[PDB]
Design a protein around this ligand. Structure first.
Ligand code: NI
Length: 341
């Protein structure tokens, strides 16, 4: 049944709750972003109102064939009224089209649902600064102090310099980048930009990317693989067997692969600096695991919550084990006592 942490009290609203059938007494289904654990259950057969960003609305229509009459896109940073309740969508700094939702309840409570987010100081200057938030439904994916990672900027710098060096040393090398959902587009687009190539990909992936309102995208992507030296493949195929295979397919146009797997976290982060990352190599194939995250680190998350000072926190991730739940609650209490709220 629909968990309590996907329900907004005092409303008829749910968040990211499409896999439970008809939720009893739900008058509006909000969708924070187009990732499968969150959209699971949507299709052309869905007939209730769906509220979301423009970008997410584009993916619903074109990828899942949801009918237009049930899609309610909302502009960001704009006060809107939904079934008699004031709401605002804010940028979540997650994947394209991902939002946080501010609910202004009739009784005076103010609720922020982060959806999936990467907290950032820039959020401290949105419409959030303008009033107090009573309850926070928090993306706690990396809520433990071992989760550190570099900025997105440092990671992109590492990937660009790596790729540029490799191809300039060997103009017959191919670069490959893995993907399994929207998000992390900067990795492959930044690399193609430094190499003077477009990114080649499957028709289905090109279609997805054309839904995202990314500026000048027609200049960066293509379905012509032959004309491109940066190839996007399913994450599953980013291994020595899958890459040896792909290389056979290019028919002696290329003689080396340099491949990137943007992971969330991996335990090399506790020890290793971004400067110090090395690939796994076999023959003429190298694979780099890079810590490009679109979720908050522990310290980023803490700064955001100590800034916001919510009266009550409801975690939305890692809620299935007692030991996880109990550890997170301990961190929230620390943060509150350290900051004085
Ligand atoms: Ni997500």
């Amino acid at each position: 049944t629909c968990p309590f942490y996907k329900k907004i009290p005092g409303t008829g609203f749910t968040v990211d709750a499409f896999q439970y059938g008809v939720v009893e007494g739900c008058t509006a289904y909000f969708l924070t972003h187009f990732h499968s654990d969150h959209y699971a259950g949507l299709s052309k057969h869905f007939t209730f109102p769906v509220y979301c960003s423009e970008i997410t609305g584009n993916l619903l229509k074109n990828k899942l064939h949801v009918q237009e009459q049930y899609i309610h896109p909302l502009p960001l940073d704009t006060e809107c009224i939904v079934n008699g309740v004031k709401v605002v969508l804010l940028d979540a700094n997650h994947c394209p089209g991902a939002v946080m939702i501010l609910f202004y309840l009739p009784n005076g409570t103010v609720i922020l649902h982060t959806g999936d987010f990467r907290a950032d100081p820039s959020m401290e200057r949105s419409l959030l600064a303008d009033q107090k938030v009573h309850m926070l439904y928090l993306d706690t994916t990396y809520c433990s102090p071992e989760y550190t990672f570099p900025s997105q900027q440092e990671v992109i710098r590492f990937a660009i310099n790596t790729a540029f060096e490799a191809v300039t040393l060997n103009p017959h090398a191919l670069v490959v980048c893995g993907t399994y959902s929207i998000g992390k587009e900067k990795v492959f687009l930044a690399i193609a930009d430094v190499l003077g190539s477009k990114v080649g990909m499957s028709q289905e992936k090109y279609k997805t990317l054309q839904c995202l309102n990314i500026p000048e995208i027609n200049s960066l992507i293509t379905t012509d693989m032959c004309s491109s030296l940066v190839h996007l493949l399913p994450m599953m195929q980013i291994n020595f067997k899958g890459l040896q295979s792909h290389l056979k397919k290019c028919g002696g146009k290329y003689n080396q692969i340099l491949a990137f797997r943007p992971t969330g976290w991996t335990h090399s982060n506790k020890f290793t600096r971004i400067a110090d990352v090395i690939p796994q190599t076999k023959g003429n194939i190298s694979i780099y695991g890079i810590p490009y995250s679109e979720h908050s680190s522990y310290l980023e998350m803490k700064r955001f919550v100590q800034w916001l000072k919510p009266q009550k926190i409801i975690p939305t991730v890692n809620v299935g084990t007692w030991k996880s739940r109990s550890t997170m609650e301990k961190y929230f209490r620390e943060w509150k006592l350290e900051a004085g709220y």
